[PDB]
Design a protein around this ligand. Structure first.
Ligand SMILES: [Mg+2]
Ligand SMILES: [Mg+2]
Ligand SMILES: [Mg+2]
Ligand SMILES: [Mg+2]
Ligand SMILES: [Mg+2]
Ligand SMILES: [Mg+2]
Ligand SMILES: [Mg+2]
Ligand SMILES: [Mg+2]
Ligand SMILES: [Mg+2]
Ligand SMILES: [Mg+2]
Ligand SMILES: [Mg+2]
Ligand SMILES: [Mg+2]
Ligand SMILES: [Mg+2]
Ligand SMILES: [Mg+2]
Ligand SMILES: [Mg+2]
Ligand code: NA
Ligand code: NA
Ligand code: NA
Ligand code: NA
Ligand code: NA
Ligand code: NA
Ligand SMILES: [Zn+2]
Ligand SMILES: [Zn+2]
Ligand SMILES: [Zn+2]
Ligand SMILES: [Zn+2]
Ligand SMILES: [Zn+2]
Ligand SMILES: [Zn+2]
Lengths: 320, 318, 320, 318, 320, 318
């Protein structure tokens, strides 16, 4: 609109807090926060994670106790990540659909104790396979697409039976959203949401989660147009929400996905992003204000919700 | 993206509060609210406004008292509307630029007491002319464009010298934003913001605030609003505004979409009156206040001039 | 196009009525008006509505008499809203599809007496359920989507049999437009139009209609992109017209919907909007000219037609 | 939106008049109509035009009589086309700016009698030059751009001083809109509108109105029209026009779509002649008049210069 | 691009014929011309049409003789329009699919005599029904959509059997393009093109053709967005070309259709357009140069081909 | 529009010549062709060009003879390329603006003989400098921008005074279009067209025509070309050109799409050489000439500078 200095001085609106606040384009609220949480078997268990300062893996009993604060702070949902006992991992990943598995038990417990809290379960075989890949291997060592979907469907169904309001397939198999959706619909789980990990990259940023091949399924970091194709398919297949993972290193993908589809768009600030920031904060290299800066970035980029291990810290800062 | 029932059921996200909250596209906050306020000449004075139940005209001392609650609620700014004593009105509208006029005095008092509170003054001749038009009349009864600008310029300069952070020309003269900006820059008022009333319509919804069709816009016209805004941005506006508000939400959306600039909207006297009247008659629930304000946000407004600002602030602070 | 003052003065075209008229971008005509009308059981009944000054609920006999004026004024269509006797409300909503229900009786009477007048019937269960929700409840108190559609289909069919040229599903069940369309097509009701309430919000503006939960089906006022998804589905499912409700508070949605789909787009100026305006007019706070301003706004925003309780007043003002 | 038969049957809305009326995308109203009118020099004079059955050239007194019916029908404006006596033509086209020329006299008389009726005068040299070109010729027979503008400027100024609310340069000189606007502004004619003939083609459809290819546009060219309009808007046009009309409806649509500005179209003499001739021969029904005019609206025109304006007005008033 | 006088003078390129020719955006060639032609029963028949000066209706023998010139001039195709003997019109329109009907006989004759000349047959019932509507009536006098399609399919098949390379459904029934396409494909007529009359308006411009109700099927002249919906469906249904009718009065529709779909786009300069222009030319009110101006307009608006009764005149003018 | 096999078979339109002809999206005509021609200093002189089989350098008298066939074929314009005698080269490139230089003499002779034939002169210093760069060198060997413009301006003015209808600056100095336009306008050369070489790349395809990377564009860059064109249009170019041609067809398409302005493309010496060489070796059919030229049209070019112009004209005239 032919705006030119000195008629236009973009510093004017920056001059005072009031005008900065009036023109501010985005704000973070507790409604944007999802807390991922690592869940152990057993009772009275609490484990620190060295590569994620301040995050603990908790048994179900201890998770229920901590969920009091989280609920009180208004965090809308948790994303549950079981820590599978090694002995329960198998070639067939059958623990993924065990009604007595950690995720299923945790879901029923939380649904009963905190009925309004959203529970987002993780649909993937990587915590259940001996070999740690996201799906079932063929005799050449490749992760088989459609056979894996069979197991992921049973898993998702088991989560729905346990009471999960949202299942989030994090597997990157082709077509899994539609297969899971069909299965849910056929079984009568009409309102279980599917939060697709649509554009999940083959990333180095996942280090600490593993603490807490893939290029044939997860996306190449170099590719951006491809992510649009991914999301389009997941929306056609029935996803209720679509997600980009990891987060900060992919903010350009979040913006293109929101702009292109105008659908509910989520982003995961993964373990390595948390660890980088925490480490720098603890070293005194960055101020704690970087936490809300990092989260504001996701809102600015177009995300509706953020899976972040900072959810509690940020919710406290915001509640003030 | 070929979304089809029953694979896509748009009710699933609506099933639970938590998922409604996660997908909710817009939220109103106190940061979005600007309170207009009618300012009297006297002292220890308030007046009730018949056509605006619940709103009082306030003398400056009273404004300072109430501004305590407004600042504590976090309301970022006020928009000052003086109520000029009749005896101060004239064909030349000289009272508009009186250094000791209501607006100027109010501004200086607020700037001193509450230095962080934004003050948005009204640049217009309508409360200063004997006939009530927004500009100066020629012998034929036409509101003269360029002669009016000369008065408006001196007005704005007086507001700036009183300390106003924002001046808001509400006059709908052609070119006034540029003339005002030029004057502010030449006088050294580098940082005074100009909040243009860019698309201000010749509307029946101004009843309660109180030939206009020769300067305010025809309600029928939408494309024209984009031309208006474009000119005001090129002329140096820091913010642009649509008035009235709800009845023009389509204009808000087009203006935000087209220009991606800081965009404001005025929920005018008549919109307040019709909502309050209905709430007082028991015809509409009080929830309609927040719904009306959420609509502005959804449509693309960055901030909202609303006589409901204090109640909305109170509700949000719950 | 680099337009700049003083070469460009946008007041020039405003200088005279003639040039204002030449450049005026939108005009309201009686072709844009649909009159909603509340229909009572019985004979010789006329009831004023306190929260809607000047609107009356009428028995069929009295509706036929008033429809003379409406036809003479050129109003193209009515939208019928029965007032169901309380004793006829039920858990199963069966009165919705009674061939002798108020809507069905009213439709046959009007179709016979005024063959060119459009009749738009309301497809929804809320006037027929004891609990007043738009659909059938499950044992958890939730409004069941697909079971409700079964009843809405029978209702729509009964309206078609009665002679309605348009059925307007106002229910906000997912998929109902396609289900109704299939049913109409299968039954031979090839030319019955479906006027989808596509983007119908969970709004406070409906107060006076009730005088004259829902968040799990009606839309969140905060959401705009979601409305596009709603309309897209309804057009794919066969709607002939798409509608936004309420009206004024959603003019931005009307504009986005018209711009995005270029399809016949309708808007409902609901009971609370009528009451607000009437109340202010009767108090002398607004001039009567606000009525045609409010209606012009819908045209400007892109609506092709407006359901408005001001239809008669506006048609008289326009006929002059 | 994946609309597919038989779920989507586009005939359903066509089934009944009432639904056709509800979905109808465009309507012609009297507000859209501008009547061109050929104005003679004498008094108690009318002339029939062989190639335009049913249209009369009218002396000013006759124009005033007929303008009674035009105003009562609600026609907003007339476009005046003088028929210059041959003896007043010259190589310098000085008659164009004669204060007592036909156009000027007609304007003053209409402005006085019917103050609310818009008068759109024609700014062009073609009815004033001995050779009939729209501008002044050099020794080689080329229509000079800038020298022509100087005459056109004085013309426009004379029209403004006679009281014309709109001047419409129909000359297709480069830059003339800006030169005219500059002159009007410097003379204080702040509110005189300029209705540019922006995209005026070198067309065979002007037969009945009566080297042109060096100034009027090549019929083959579409993109070029957008460049023409762009320049005229930047130069200060209040309205822009395409001429001829029906044969250029694609241009109307592109111009409206691209610029969102007040857009006009001229249904020229040859288009009138061919429609009337066909109606008089019994080859086309009279309904073709309203269909032709609806086409302009559908294509995006805000207003239409049409010799059918009175009959269309009569038909609409039914 | 900030172009401003006097740096930019758009007259410079107009100064000389050479530069006008270099910058000229569109040209008409004989490849753009399709000649419609009225075909009589019998032998040695030639009839002038008073409302279309210079156009004759011809029996097949005389058509073959005239087609020599047309072929020699390079006209790519004819559009055949039979003149059905009144006695052969019926309620069932069965003459439409008679293998010995005028259109079928004419097609076989032309295909044999001029194998490279395109023949475009007219698929519609209006020349075959006693009542002259485009389809079959129901007992309320309405033109039935799907029953009409049954007859149009048999017609199109009969044209394909006769050797037509293109069938052009001019009926404006919903869905007919897909039904005809399915039928052609099933029967093995893999390469018969379908030239859909997609946006055919209810127009006064057809007068002279009739010399040589409809609002429930043909389009309202007022509607433009609706035409896009029409074309979209016809392309989805398998049309190879899409057409707007009438022509000049709808150039804005031609431009929107070409711009939106980028598909082969045709336009019909109908009988009334020909008659208007001829009449004015014969009266001396317009120069003959208007013919090529009118045709250039269609090219400029985006048409790939033009059905025009001026095809021979224009082809001669162009061949020079 | 959800087109799917077998409902949609894109071969159906390809089945027959007649349908291929009806749907064909672009056609080459003689109106699209501009012939470049190398012009010698002498008289009764021709020279064969080793790296451009079939093209002759021609003295002016020879050019006039051949121009007979070119005009009779309908070729609209020639682009003149003088071959400067070495002794006339200098560090100041003064020969560029010699009123009796090759280009000037050729222009005057053609303008007189064939008044309707367009002449496009080359505005560049490369055939006038001793070192062969397109501009004047500083002491460090850099091609100076603004000093070069001053020479180019005088060149262009000399071409205009010789009668050239189009001057085509091929130099790739920044700002030269504006400087040239300013000079032409101030001198009264109102109608002299400027055909800017807007996006002229530092290319290996100029081999046969005969630090360049500091002024000609990097082959890798596409977006940059739009910035180049934008500036030349704002500076007053009447036409804009991409060079080389085939290897840059994507640039042609983007430039036409973005600006909708008269767009030209140069099929350079190396493109001619590689096609002819292949045709002479029997490796490619002669049909490749028309295919190469159809590509330019398809990509969006309005006109094409091509050494094949005469043969293509001959082929089209079949
Ligand atoms: Mg995928
Ligand atoms: Mg957001
Ligand atoms: Mg006190
Ligand atoms: Mg303005
Ligand atoms: Mg916002
Ligand atoms: Mg829906
Ligand atoms: Mg509309
Ligand atoms: Mg008399
Ligand atoms: Mg121009
Ligand atoms: Mg319009
Ligand atoms: Mg169709
Ligand atoms: Mg084309
Ligand atoms: Mg010789
Ligand atoms: Mg450059
Ligand atoms: Mg081209
Ligand atoms: Na959110
Ligand atoms: Na804000
Ligand atoms: Na309408
Ligand atoms: Na209009
Ligand atoms: Na073609
Ligand atoms: Na060309
Ligand atoms: Zn996994
Ligand atoms: Zn004012
Ligand atoms: Zn309901
Ligand atoms: Zn003229
Ligand atoms: Zn037909
Ligand atoms: Zn060079």
């Amino acid at each position: 609109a032919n705006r030119a200095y000195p008629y236009t001085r973009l510093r004017r609106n920056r001059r005072d807090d009031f005008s900065r606040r009036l023109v501010r384009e985005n704000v973070l609220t507790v409604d944007d926060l999802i807390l991922p949480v690592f869940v152990l078997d057993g009772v009275n268990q609490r484990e620190s994670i060295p590569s994620m300062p301040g995050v603990e893996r908790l048994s179900i009993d201890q998770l229920l106790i901590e969920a009091e604060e989280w609920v009180a702070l208004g965090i809308p949902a948790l994303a549950l990540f079981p820590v599978t006992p090694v002995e329960k991992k198998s070639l067939d990943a059958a623990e993924a659909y065990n009604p007595e598995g950690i995720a299923q038990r945790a879901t029923r417990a939380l649904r009963e104790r905190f009925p309004e809290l959203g529970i987002i379960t993780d649909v993937c075989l990587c915590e259940f396979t001996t070999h740690g890949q996201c799906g079932i291997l063929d005799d050449d060592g490749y992760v088989l697409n459609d056979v894996s979907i069979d197991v992921l469907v049973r898993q998702a169904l088991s989560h729905a039976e346990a009471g999960a309001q949202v299942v989030a397939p994090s597997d990157m198999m082709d077509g899994r959203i539609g297969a899971i959706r069909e299965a849910l619909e056929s079984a009568g789980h009409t309102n279980v949401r599917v939060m697709a990990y649509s554009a999940k990259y083959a990333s180095a940023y996942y280090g600490p989660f593993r603490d807490a091949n893939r290029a044939t399924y997860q996306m190449d970091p170099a590719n951006s147009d491809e992510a649009l194709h991914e999301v389009a398919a997941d929306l056609a297949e029935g996803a209720d929400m679509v997600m980009v993972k990891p987060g900060m290193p992919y903010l350009d993908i979040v913006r293109r996905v929101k702009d292109e589809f105008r659908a509910p768009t989520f982003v995961y600030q993964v373990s390595g992003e948390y660890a980088m920031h925490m480490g720098a904060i603890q070293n005194g290299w960055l101020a704690e204000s970087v936490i809300l800066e990092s989260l504001t970035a996701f809102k600015r980029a177009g995300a509706d919700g953020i899976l972040t291990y900072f959810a509690k810290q940020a919710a406290e800062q915001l509640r003030r």
